Curated annotation (Swiss-Prot), chains A, B, C, D:
Residues annotated to bind a 1,2-diacyl-sn-glycero-3-phospho-(1D-myo-inositol-3,4-bisphosphate): D138, K143, V144, R145, K170, R174
Annotated compartments: Cytoplasm
Amino acids binding (+)-alpha-tocopherol: F140
GO terms, molecular function: lipid transfer activity; phosphatidylinositol bisphosphate binding; phosphatidylinositol-3,4-bisphosphate binding; phosphatidylinositol-4,5-bisphosphate binding; vitamin E binding
Keywords in alphabetical order: Cytoplasm, Disease variant, Lipid-binding, Transport
Name used for this protein in its record: Alpha-tocopherol transfer protein
Connected disease: Ataxia with vitamin E deficiency: An autosomal recessive disease characterized by undetectable or markedly reduced plasma levels of vitamin E, spinocerebellar degeneration, ataxia, areflexia and proprioception loss.
Lineage of the organism: Eukaryota, Metazoa, Chordata, Craniata, Vertebrata
Organism field: Homo sapiens (Human)
């Protein structure tokens, strides 16, 4: 059985110095005021999962990366805060990091920003923005190998401009903005695995979201134990 | 009743150091040779108001910013100087800064540059250009949250290139150039509130200009007292 | 009519440098993370007032100081947080600072710590503790001329030890601990003005608390305007 | 299942640097000449346990701290050395550190120094004294939240004066000396949980000692494995 350290080693190519620094930040990144709680039980965000906000593709990309999909239109900012939504990503991340192949080949993100509103942007404070940059760079044992933004409205770059200065050069050149005509370019990066809504052949986003919702609910006891092991 | 200092505090998030520096510049920015007078009575620029050069939307943008509209085609450079036109903005600014919600949520500018001529550019000397940059950055207690240029002719960037080096990074990334196809992108930033000429639903620019002209004329006694309180 | 600056000048013996620094801290002390809101309306803490937690003596001490009394036993930590309780002191402070004689002769505090529990101490985090020290020293335009602790249980000094290192030498030598046998020594500091419960002759704490509760409720519109003038 | 590192992280509020330094000292503190062995089997100190020298309260204090009681009168210095007695505390400590709530809320100590003799003091050499200070400060993953000395004879401070210079400021202000009249003040710190001998209501020290003796004997195999894992 793997140590807790092994996922941090694999995240930094078995460089013990870098893995150690990542481990340090992993334990303190939440503590940055205002803090986000260590609670990882799905009960407070099950509405988000049911709304079809988020899902994970069952198949990997050509490099073996786990592929995550987020749909901002299914996040109601009146009901769920940025911290609720961030907690969903933390829950997903703690689950997929258990896979060794994900530890080795990292992850890729697809953000459908269609329906992004100013109400969404209101949630993204400078404190939240730098927390976003933290988990994307050096505060969580997952290698972000690519970030793909699709259907981005012009009003979004104000939010991105808040996040950008806290991003490393490595992650910045891994961010792709495809616009409303995303299908061809997105298909190039992710052949055979995309859902129907994004140019895929077989599965729909609804099934993908429901499947991941079930997996999260099913893993609620592991999530509770992880929450216990970081406080 | 608010002190005179409160609008400067709100302009700099109640940082007394920064508010103090802003207050210092507010009193000396006009004095930069060649100086612009402290006269704020509308009698010398009523022709500009009647020509429909400028107006303020009655409703705020999604973030609560006051929205100002300028139309360069309605400025006759043969009749009014750059100082006359600048005085119009000063008059408007001293009026809208009285609103606490504007003090908190700042302003956004829409410049219809359709009909911009070389005769307009002739008025924009280096001295005028840096005065423009001064009030936009750190010489007036109003937070410029966005500048939107529409219908910009290619000959305009020479003027913008004069202004740019005196602009901070903050204000530079808040400037948007939409070109002649501005409607969709402008509507994204300003839903429900734009006039008919710019994709809106109800009000026309003429009514908006006339309404603001009336408010300025109505406020002529307050404007005189402000002019007295800065000299 | 006095400026807003005058209360800060009187707080620092008309030293403009010191008054200015106090004014700076007055605007930023709440902002220290985690922040306490600027809300000063009594609606959220009326239960505390009705419980008889706090009251102000109608007569001043021999040096002209306003005298405040707090009773920790009437604070239910299950119902009200430390921030609720702190807000009560802020509300009282913004009201009594309006009196010029209080601006000149400062205030004195009497804390009846009888009934202090660990549940009370649980509310006093390091962040709260340093906020306490801030308003007591150089973040509010009121001169704390004396702090009198009575009926202090032995378990309280742990809390005081949290506050002490953030206290100046001036305020530390103005703190008095009288124990359970407080009457004689307390009477020396405050002749003729104490309530019946603390060795006084005429008024009871209940009447004093009810009288101050009424004054706070009566001043709810001024409190709202103050809250507006600091945000 | 928790790593071995987790108890050190919880001991230093998940500060990886501080937890690492604590882990370093945990492995080397015994090695300080003259060394104390890593033997943790109760067979060599069962006489001490049977003599009623030491026991652990079944209920926690109001802050969730585990409460330990030592009775110096039940230590015969002719039969057991300081190293034997120290080993008893090590055995107890390695057992109670397994509880997560103890890892989070630390421990508190009650030392009944009634019957302290010069024969006891003879055992406390400078080397022993600094070993005492080591485990109390930064050499064992248990947070000492309070040390309560009761019935201390005047001849004891000579011993305490040997220990004091090696103690941090944090632990020094957590040491309480109650004297022979300890009951009221001790009851304040530890309501509802004290034994009959110290003002409690239900349980006697004899039962408490016997209960902890049984738990130690019952845990003899875990104690052997721990001894194996540090050499
Ligand atoms: C380990 C890990 C975490 C924890 C994670 C992400 C990736 C990770 O590997 C991606 C998303 C994020 C940062 C949560 C973001 C929460 C926000 C509030 C919702 C999205 C709103 C953004 C304004 C729009 C997309 C931002 C992209 C530029 C990432 O959480
Ligand atoms: C407080 C305040 C003032 C005083 C103000 C503006 C905004 C403010 O918040 C915007 C406009 C400006 C700077 C007056 C400009 C006067 C010139 C002569 C007319 C416009 C000609 C410009 C070449 C074209 C638009 C320039 C934009 C880049 C601002 O006056
Ligand atoms: C301007 C001003 C404020 C704002 C003020 C006080 C005096 C002021 O002049 C005294 C009280 C305090 C600091 C509020 C304290 C709130 C706490 C949570 C309740 C009391 C609990 C303390 C652990 C016990 C008494 C502390 C004394 C040592 C002050 O608020
Ligand atoms: C992890 C840990 C250990 C290991 C520990 C204690 C507390 C801990 O958290 C308290 C007691 C001690 C230090 C053992 C002390 C052994 C001596 C020889 C017996 C007591 C004699 C002392 C002269 C009198 C009491 C000293 C107090 C000031 C601690 O062992
Ligand atoms: Cl939270
Ligand atoms: Cl845009
Ligand atoms: Cl002029
Ligand atoms: Cl060109
Ligand atoms: Cl609050
Ligand atoms: Cl005590
Ligand atoms: Cl030995
Ligand atoms: Cl003596």
């Amino acid at each position: 059985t793997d140590s807790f350290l092994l996922r941090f080693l694999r995240a930094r190519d078995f460089d013990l110095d870098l893995a150690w620094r990542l481990l340090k930040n992993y334990y303190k990144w939440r503590a940055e005021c205002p803090e986000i709680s260590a609670d990882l039980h799905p009960r407070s965000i099950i509405g988000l999962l049911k709304a079809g906000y988020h899902g994970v593709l069952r198949s990997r990309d050509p490099t073996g990366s786990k592929v995550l999909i987020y749909r901002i239109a299914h996040w109601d900012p009146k009901v769920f805060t940025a911290y609720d939504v961030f907690r969903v990503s933390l829950i997903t991340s703690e689950l997929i990091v258990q896979e060794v192949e994900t530890q080795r080949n990292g992850i890729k993100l697809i953000f459908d920003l269609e329906g992004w509103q100013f109400s969404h942007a209101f949630q993204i404070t400078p404190s939240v923005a730098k927390k976003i940059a933290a988990v994307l760079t050096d505060s969580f044992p997952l290698k972000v190998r690519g970030i793909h933004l699709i259907n981005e409205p012009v009003i979004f770059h104000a939010v991105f401009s808040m996040i950008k200065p806290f991003l490393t050069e490595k992650i910045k050149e891994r961010i792709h903005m495809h616009g409303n005509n995303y299908k061809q370019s997105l298909l190039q990066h992710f052949p055979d695995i995309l859902p129907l809504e994004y140019g895929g052949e077989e599965f729909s986003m609804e099934d993908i979201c429901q499947e991941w919702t079930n997996f999260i609910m099913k893993s609620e006891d592991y999530l509770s134990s992880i929450s216990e092991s970081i406080q």
